[PDB]
Design a protein around this ligand. Structure first.
Ligand SMILES: [Cl-]
Ligand code: NA
Length: 129
């Protein structure tokens, strides 16, 4: 599923990301735009052979099992395919663990390089929330 910008902001709010660990909703939406273009089926291979999955491009090196990432972990206890669902509950729940792991949203290099310190509230401007 390819979400619209306000559609995604609403589903993230419902599943509790708004101000989770202090990150306003526009931070989450900006991260989703640059990680996946709001597409839940996005996948991208990393140079180390891990893969990133779904709307927030969660990596199989640490967070989900894809069966083909040697020496990796599964800290969210899910198959990475779960992270491609039109239902974003699994990605959100796993994201809450990631952003609690100590580096906040810097875990998302696209967030650090394209969202951090910008006017992220523009990403939810006008959204009936
Ligand atoms: Cl933080
Ligand atoms: Na893994």
């Amino acid at each position: 599923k390819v979400f619209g910008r306000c559609e995604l902001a609403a589903a993230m709010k419902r599943h509790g990301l708004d101000n989770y660990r202090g990150y306003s909703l526009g931070n989450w939406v900006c991260a989703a735009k640059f990680e996946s273009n709001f597409n839940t089926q996005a996948t991208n291979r990393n140079t180390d052979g891990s893969t990133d999955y779904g709307i927030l491009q969660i990596n199989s090196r640490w967070w989900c099992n894809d069966g083909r990432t040697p020496g990796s972990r599964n800290l969210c206890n899910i198959p990475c395919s779960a992270l491609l669902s039109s239902d974003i509950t699994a990605s959100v729940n796993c994201a809450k663990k990631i952003v609690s792991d100590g580096n906040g949203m810097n875990a998302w290099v696209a967030w650090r390089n394209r969202c951090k310190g910008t006017d992220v509230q523009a990403w939810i401007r006008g959204c009936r929330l």
